[PDB]
Amino acid sequence: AGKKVLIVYAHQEPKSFNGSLKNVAVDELSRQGCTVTVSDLYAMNFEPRATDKDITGTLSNPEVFNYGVETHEAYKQRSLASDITDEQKKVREADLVIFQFPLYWFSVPAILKGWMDRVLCQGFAFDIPGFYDSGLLQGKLALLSVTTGGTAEMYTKTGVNGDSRYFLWPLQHGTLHFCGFKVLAPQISFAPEIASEEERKGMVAAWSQRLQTIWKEEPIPCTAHWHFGQ
Amino acid sequence: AGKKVLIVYAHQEPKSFNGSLKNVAVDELSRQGCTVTVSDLYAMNFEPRATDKDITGTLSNPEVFNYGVETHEAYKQRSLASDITDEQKKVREADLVIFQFPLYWFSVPAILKGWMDRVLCQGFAFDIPGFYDSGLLQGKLALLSVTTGGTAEMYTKTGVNGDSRYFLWPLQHGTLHFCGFKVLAPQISFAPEIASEEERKGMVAAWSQRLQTIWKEEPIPCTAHWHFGQ
Numbered sequence: 133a134g135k136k137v138l139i140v141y142a143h144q145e146p147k148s149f150n151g152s153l154k155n156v157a158v159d160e161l162s163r164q165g166c167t168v169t170v171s172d173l174y175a176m177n178f179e180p181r182a183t184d185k186d187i188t189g190t191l192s193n194p195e196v197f198n199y200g201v202e203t204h205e206a207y208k209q210r211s212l213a214s215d216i217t218d219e220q221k222k223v224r225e226a227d228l229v230i231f232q233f234p235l236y237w238f239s240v241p242a243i244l245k246g247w248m249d250r251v252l253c254q255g256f257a258f259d260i261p262g263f264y265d266s267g268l269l270q271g272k273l274a275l276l277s278v279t280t281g282g283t284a285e286m287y288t289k290t291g292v293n294g295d296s297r298y299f300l301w302p303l304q305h306g307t308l309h310f311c312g313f314k315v316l317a318p319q320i321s322f323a324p325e326i327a328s329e330e331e332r333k334g335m336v337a338a339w340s341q342r343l344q345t346i347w348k349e350e351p352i353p354c355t356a357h358w359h360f361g362q
Numbered sequence: 363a364g365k366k367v368l369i370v371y372a373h374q375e376p377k378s379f380n381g382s383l384k385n386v387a388v389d390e391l392s393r394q395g396c397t398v399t400v401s402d403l404y405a406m407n408f409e410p411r412a413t414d415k416d417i418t419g420t421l422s423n424p425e426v427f428n429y430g431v432e433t434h435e436a437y438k439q440r441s442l443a444s445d446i447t448d449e450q451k452k453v454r455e456a457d458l459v460i461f462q463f464p465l466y467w468f469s470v471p472a473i474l475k476g477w478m479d480r481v482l483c484q485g486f487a488f489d490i491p492g493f494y495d496s497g498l499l500q501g502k503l504a505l506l507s508v509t510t511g512g513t514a515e516m517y518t519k520t521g522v523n524g525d526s527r528y529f530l531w532p533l534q535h536g537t538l539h540f541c542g543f544k545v546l547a548p549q550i551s552f553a554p555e556i557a558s559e560e561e562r563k564g565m566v567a568a569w570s571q572r573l574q575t576i577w578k579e580e581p582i583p584c585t586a587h588w589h590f591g592q
């Protein structure tokens with residue numbers, strides 16, 4: 133209600149399963165009266181590489197280029213590439229940011245990692261000091277919606293891949309929390325390519341039905357215990 | 363044959379700390395008689411986006427695009443883009459692969475994440491099934507050479523970032539071990555920017571002497587327990 137939602141989407145095919153979890157998310161939040169924005173990275177042809185072209189202006193120190201130092205500088209001078217500035221503008225408005233993506237090597241597809249590297253710069257998403265609980269994006273909610281080729285069986289402490297929670301750490305704690313987001317419980321749709329229709333349709337339902345009360349939720353305790361047990 | 367090394371370098375500045383760890387690696391390994399090859403992803407302007415342009419010719423179903431599927435086939439009928447081909451040939455010949463990069467959001471810079479997303483495709487680095495111990499790259503050695511913004515204490519069970527082994531999981535286990543690599547303990551250089559000329563030169567020396575006995579080091583027991591403790 134009145135809330136603004138940002139969905140950063142990372143999938144090349146609209147007909148894909150990720151596409152349906154995304155459309156589902158879009159229809160429901162909208163149907164509820166929420167303002168919804170979507171960043172379909174692939175269709176934007178989003179630049180994922182961190183380069184000096186990200187700072188249009190003149191560098192304070194061109195002798196030894198430090199992307200970290202320069203983008204912090206550029207942000208204060210409003211001289212970051214317009215594509216990054218557009219995204220930061222969306223994040224800044226959002227009350228809720230959803231990441232929709234297929235797991236790639238236990239992480240986010242590279243194009244989305246680029247979005248994280250280029251969009252969450254110092255001065256914008258966090259300050260030193262002013263990170264973790266005093267991150268600059270405090271007051272906002274973040275949620276990861278991950279689809280996997282592997283199965284729930286495969287993703288357990290006594291399974292090959294280890295409990296799926298282990299690979300959420302760099303993203304949930306290292307990124308979102310570091311920036312002040314309150315982290316909601318992740319949506320993990322396991323092995324959709326494998327499951328039958330009466331499963332790929334049950335997962336979606338779960339996503340949809342879950343989105344129906346999303347504003348009802350409380351963040352998770354983004355700790356090592358939560359992620360790795362003991 | 364014996365001792366071929368591939369270094370995947372992921373930094374934009376040649377005069378950066380990252381640049382030196384890489385130069386000393388190249389020199390020290392070459393001096394011991396090793397065959398060294400470097401992949402400066404930034405100078406190559408490496409493409410990290412997982413798209414249709416990764417396949418030369420006409421898709422095996424452009425109607426509904428699925429990256430995994432499509433590349434496995436392109437790989438089988440030898441039709442992958444020339445850049446993915448070049449890297450794969452480089453990997454195929456190496457006995458040891460080193461990843462030299464600064465830590466970005468507890469992971470690798472998007473550009474290096476793309477390399478993995480696109481170079482380690484089904485059919486080349488692993489198969490379904492055919493992974494971890496039965497991965498197609500079984501028998502090679504991998505090492506992660508990482509630099510951080512955070513200081514040593516920050517990366518402990520009591521620090522705000524938690525033990526560094528936590529973010530190593532996705533890279534070391536979910537990627538390398540999964541492709542069948544044998545993983546040597548990671549080389550981590552803490553906060554080279556905050557350190558002093560004196561201190562940085564000390565970390566560079568460390569990396570160097572280590573490269574001298576790197577061939578006699580035993581791989582780590584890359585297990586869920588190694589990374590997360592008891």
Ligand SMILES: Cc1cc2nc3c(=O)[nH]c(=O)nc-3n(C[C@H](O)[C@H](O)[C@H](O)COP(=O)(O)OP(=O)(O)OC[C@H]3O[C@@H](n4cnc5c(N)ncnc54)[C@H](O)[C@@H]3O)c2cc1C
Pocket residue numbers: 143147148149150151152234235236237238239279280281282283324325329332333336428429430478479480536
């Ligand atoms: C580079 C790379 C690395 C990877 N690394 C990992 C990894 O580390 N771990 C892991 O577990 N997996 C990994 N994967 C696999 C990946 O996570 C899965 O392939 C992906 O999650 C599948 O989701 P999708 O959105 O592509 O679905 P799809 O491939 O589209 O499959 C879903 C099926 O359901 C159909 N469908 C679409 N919409 C609906 C709907 N509304 N209702 C029902 N069915 C629908 C589709 O047409 C399709 O046939 C990797 C893949 C790649 C390319």
Ligand SMILES: Cc1cc2nc3c(=O)[nH]c(=O)nc-3n(C[C@H](O)[C@H](O)[C@H](O)COP(=O)(O)OP(=O)(O)OC[C@H]3O[C@@H](n4cnc5c(N)ncnc54)[C@H](O)[C@@H]3O)c2cc1C
Pocket residue numbers: 196198199200248249250306373377378379380381382463464465466467468469509510511512513554555559562563566
């Ligand atoms: C998008 C982004 C996200 C990040 N996320 C994280 C994160 O999650 N966690 C984290 O801890 N950090 C993070 N960082 C920080 C980043 O990891 C560090 O900035 C990086 O590791 C520093 O390495 P460098 O090679 O850039 O060093 P440099 O900035 O190049 O510093 C080394 C300096 O030492 C000088 N020097 C002196 N002696 C030598 C010598 N012998 N040879 C060469 N150089 C020497 C160099 O010339 C140089 O000026 C992030 C930064 C960015 C940009």
Ligand SMILES: COc1ccc2[nH]c(I)c(CCNC(C)=O)c2c1
Pocket residue numbers: 237238281282283286293325429430431483484490536540
């Ligand atoms: C369960 O752990 C992993 C780890 C790395 C992986 N890389 C790929 I590619 C897959 C799934 C393959 N399916 C498709 C459509 O490509 C995968 C699964």
Ligand SMILES: COc1ccc2[nH]c(I)c(CCNC(C)=O)c2c1
Pocket residue numbers: 200201254260306310467468511512513516523553
């Ligand atoms: C510890 O987690 C992160 C996460 C994202 C980050 N982006 C930058 I630039 C830094 C370096 C900030 N300096 C110090 C001493 O932390 C950084 C550190």
Ligand SMILES: [Zn+2]
Pocket residue numbers: 304305306309310353354355
């Ligand atoms: Zn946390």
Ligand SMILES: [Zn+2]
Pocket residue numbers: 534535536539540584585586
């Ligand atoms: Zn392992």
